[PDB]
Symmetry: C3
Subunit: 346 residues, 3 copies
């Protein structure tokens, strides 16, 4: 059974949103548009859902103003918003599954905080978390169970650090950053001096890592500091689980890096970039703004222009689509040769 | 340390032997490396090289492979069961397992007043059990592990140190979780805005880990927005694997290390995923499908059998295409052999 | 707070190095060769750069004696060394940026140490680290916050273990070994016996993990133990972030494994081997000494002689470079066929 029941109108009012349809319609859960039934709230998200909308049995559909002007004649209950539909849907989702926390509010007796560390107002620090010398945790932060905030590291207001995250020394974490469990920020970069015919001597890496506002970093993802320059991750970028970011990597604004991709040292990535799952980018190159790399891409040279790329080495997608096809067509090209090899006349 | 004779072993294992029964054995070893004091085993068409000239004092072997080598004057232990399983029986005679030496519930374990901890459970130093969690009987919760809000761990499960189990996770019976794993990380899903900017969505689905599942070190399993992610019973998952939001892994399936499945993909029962393979989201993998290491699965696999390559094709077809790509200089030379016969002048 | 400025001459005296140029030149930081300004010390270690040298604006360039001869005519401030310019550069770096510890000296009161664990002199153990029955921490070792040192595991003198590393039971860690946060040393190997109905039997692992001296291991890298014999990483090898080292893998000496690479069971890597980022190596094979594997390599067969290998399946550099070129050429190739086929024989 469900947690709550709402009428269309009651919910529209709660959401400070407009509605069209039957205000007395009863709503008791959420569902994706292709599976929603009378009782369900759903949303339309701007894709080929034309016929997904007409055939929708949902009791309430969250739709933007522009999209509603186009489907005004349809006999459906709409919740009409100026915000993005998915975001308003999120608000409806949390009426049915309320978000929950660990049950340890404020600073826990077992939190270890260095006397020189500065903790601001209204912060939560969970069991066994460690805050090292001269660190600075901004107001309304959450430091999860057993996380380490390293020496001289700053954490901007409203950031949410999950359990067992390690933030090493000299790391700048911006406002409203979300780090999932098991991330390591400011691990030493993979750089050495070579000696005695190939033996490798450790170099101390003294660069920072700068994590700007509204950045998210996924579970077990590792971000290496530069040797003397900073690794940076700019505003609004999101980074999925299990990603390697190497020393002195720059990742521009509102970029996205999907699980298990890796970027080698000293590479810059532009703004509005998508790096697909398991892709890899060599060191010492650049990726332009608005580039999209397909999963499992291997980037060997700089990309200087926007568009989709894939393969290894990466090529513009038109080129590798062609490549895969010509390769698959090899036997048919060989029978084409053998037939033309048969013609050996006088 | 103890010692066993060939007859003294055959009788314990309840197995038939052949050779010198008074032979003295004192350990296990790999077929190539085993001397007189060593028990070994054969379980390959591709390890037969090392049998003809082995020095083991006992060779565990199947009724099938025995038919090839019974003429050889080696000491055998012949089984109608898995040679490797019987091998394990011998190995567990010579090496004992060892624990931390922190029995029961440690004084430093933080258990929220509203959590339920059953009987005969071990919770190691600095582990944190959050509100309304249920830890079943005969469980082991490793040092510094987190058991999130409203999460349950079925009886006889084993959570290694520094594992993070987040909110509303269901861990089934006799599950083993290796160190560093993160169960119930947030799925990589965002709301894109007017200016290409990405808005965080709290993911509120469950992760359901069924009975007998094992999960490797530093592996990450994401939860769906509101629908569930599932790893069905029997499935074994290796190190450094990404399991994305709302993925469903069928029963008795294997996912090898560094492999990755993208959001909303369903994997059938008895599927093997070779290492470093990635599979795209929103597709289906049929039961009994085997993906080779480094496979790149772009489209749903409808039929069972072995697949490999990127894009994924059946074994026979990629093996073929690898051969035909290798043969391109030959193919071009026979075009040069043909562009030379333009000697057709008049 | 090292807002510090030194003179080129002071620098040279500190470093014990010859200089060419204005000794009064004021240096107040470090920079990479193509960005260095008059306030900046930089270095040239690779001839791969050197094109940035002629135009360089650095207030000092750390250079070798050979390179000086090559570039003598030039009007630059040089610090001339018989050592590695990158190792001399490091001494300058450390002059402007000072390493910082956590500020938790010695053994922190909240460290759990089993009555049967052995702790030597001058050891740091940080808040909430856990040391199990019969473990051994060497002299002058650092055990970072919340790290676990498992049952009967030894950590050799002068090792540095960062926060939340899990060192499991029966792991030997050598001298001077560094382990970045989150690595897991001694997880169970991935070993099973699939039954007729399709179900998979867990095989208990009781072998060990041996990490030799001067080895380094990256963040969240995971090194599994063997069914009955040890996984081993030999002297001076450096393993990057997020790597899979399976059960019974042996890594030789002075080898390097770049991030996300992976190696399957019972595989042998020789000495002075480089495995590139994201590369993958099957089980039960060997890689010869002095082999270089390109990034994203898929090695399916043993490499038995030295050199450079790339692609998936891996081939020597020559065969793989040629293959890419020939695949790249298929439209041009069938174009030659398209021209041929319009014969009227
Ligand atoms: C993959 C990648 O991107 N770089 C690799 C390469 O870097 P490489 O040796 O080229 O230089 P690194 O990036 O390691 O050194 C740090 C910085 O020094 C600067 N610099 C380098 C040489 C020089 O003569 N003058 C100078 O100013 C470079 O711009 C670099 O950003 O070999 C190192 C040897 O272990 C690895 O750590 C690095 O991962
Ligand atoms: C140049 C080799 C050809 C194949 C294409 C390879 C693309 C590069 C993949 C490297 C993975 C990046 C991992 C980061 C490692 C690090 O630098 O610390
Ligand atoms: C169309 C894709 C081209 C290549 C095919 C390779 C399959 C993709 C591999 C990606 C694996 C990573 C999945 C995690 C995704 C996530 O968490 O959002
Ligand atoms: C066509 C041949 C397949 C492609 C080549 C892939 C080479 C192997 C890549 C996977 C590495 C396996 C490491 C996983 C460790 C483990 O088994 O636990």
């Amino acid at each position: 059974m469900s947690q709550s029941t709402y009428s269309l109108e009651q919910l529209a009012d709660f959401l400070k949103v407009e509605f069209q349809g039957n205000g007395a319609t009863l709503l008791s859960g959420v569902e994706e548009i292709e599976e929603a039934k009378t009782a369900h709230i759903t949303f339309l998200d701007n894709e080929k859902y034309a016929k997904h909308l007409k055939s929708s049995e949902a009791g309430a559909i969250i739709i933007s103003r522009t999209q509603f002007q186009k489907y005004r004649d349809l006999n459906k209950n709409f919740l009409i918003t100026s915000e993005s539909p998915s975001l308003v849907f999120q608000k409806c989702l949390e009426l049915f599954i309320t978000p929950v926390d660990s049950g340890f509010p404020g600073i826990h007796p077992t939190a270890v905080i260095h006397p020189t560390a500065i903790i601001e107002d209204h912060v939560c620090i969970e069991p066994y978390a460690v805050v090292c010398q001269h660190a600075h945790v901004g107001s309304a932060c959450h430091i999860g169970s057993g996380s380490v905030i390293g020496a001289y590291s700053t954490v901007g207001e409203h950031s949410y650090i999950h359990p067992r995250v390690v933030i090493r020394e000299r790391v700048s974490i911006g406002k409203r950053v979300i780090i999932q469990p098991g991330a390591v920020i400011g691990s030493c970069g993979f750089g050495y001096v070579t000696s005695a015919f190939g033996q490798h001597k450790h170099l101390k890496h003294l660069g920072k890592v700068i994590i700007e506002d509204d950045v998210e970093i996924g579970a077990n993802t590792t971000i290496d500091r530069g040797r003397f320059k900073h690794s940076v991750v700019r505003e609004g970028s999101k980074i999925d689980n299990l990603v390697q970011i190497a020393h002195q990597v720059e990742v521009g604004q509102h970029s996205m890096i999907v699980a298990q991709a890796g970027i080698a040292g000293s590479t810059k990535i532009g703004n509005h970039v998508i790096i697909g799952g398991q892709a890899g980018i060599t060191g010492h190159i650049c990726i332009a703004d608005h580039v999209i790399m397909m999963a499992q891409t291997g980037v060997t040279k700089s990309i200087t222009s926007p568009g989709i790329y894939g393969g290894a080495p990466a090529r513009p997608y038109q080129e590798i689509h062609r490549q895969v096809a010509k390769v698959r067509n090899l036997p048919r090209l060989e029978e084409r040769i053998a037939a033309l090899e048969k013609l050996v006349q006088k």
